[PDB]
Design a protein around this ligand. Structure first.
Ligand SMILES: CCCCCCCCCCCCCCCCOC[C@H](COCC(F)(F)F)OP(=O)(O)OC
Ligand SMILES: [Ca+2]
Ligand SMILES: [Ca+2]
Lengths: 124, 124
């Protein structure tokens, strides 16, 4: 679930403001996404977008006929470190893993301010 | 912009978890929006939607070539009172008011558990 994904990001990037920082960055960070990613961070986002597409295709997620951002899962934070609970059944694990991978990726990639809030219409 | 809407929701509603409690509610609180709203709180969401559409068709917003969540404005919170700053240019002031009206609306609309995370393709 999206709020979880936001919570995950905070985990890895302790003082972050995830909506403020990552929603409307590059061509792919924020609802929507097309064109060539503008940096590694941007590529983190296109990857998460794909993962979710994969998720919706995955047989285990067949009864999931809403957005993956609507699928609750179980995860926990231990000092910047994210764990997707063994508990999770197969769809929820895959999604949780999608969201987990993205936050780590976020927490590794450079954030280039200039890439924020792009005229996606004119550059993506 | 979206981060500011979240904060507005947190202002008008001290206890709130905006992404967790208002995202994926009813037929309109979330992505897209069709169907018959299920209750007042949904209608707050439908109303906001209608407000962002009004903004995409606003002459004052003609150079806003993208979605109003990406539009940043000036606001303040005081004693559960959200303030759209008078120095806002018109598009900004318009967007800001769509948000506080929705944020205020959430605060007075009753929250129905049973309308949370609905099967939308089925019921909306
Ligand atoms: C701001 C308040 C939201 C909570 C109450 C809102 C009431 C209902 C209005 C709809 C809310 C908008 C829902 C859409 C959210 C879009 O969010 C999608 C996401 C934006 O940031 C997500 C992040 F992970 F970064 F935190 O982009 P994505 O590319 O998936 O991730 C980078
Ligand atoms: Ca995206
Ligand atoms: Ca909506």
């Amino acid at each position: 679930a999206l709020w979880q994904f936001r919570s995950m990001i905070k985990c890895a990037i302790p003082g972050s403001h995830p909506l403020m920082d990552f929603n409307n960055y590059g061509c792919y960070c924020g609802l929507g996404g097309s064109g060539t990613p503008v940096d590694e961070l941007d590529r983190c986002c296109e990857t998460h977008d794909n993962c979710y597409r994969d998720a919706k295709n995955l047989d285990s997620c067949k009864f999931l006929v809403d957005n993956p951002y609507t699928e609750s899962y179980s995860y926990s934070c231990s000092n910047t470190e994210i764990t997707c609970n063994s508990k999770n059944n197969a769809c929820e694990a895959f999604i949780c893993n999608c969201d987990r991978n993205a936050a780590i990726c976020f927490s590794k990639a450079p954030y280039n301010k200039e890439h924020k809030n792009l005229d996606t219409k004119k550059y993506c």
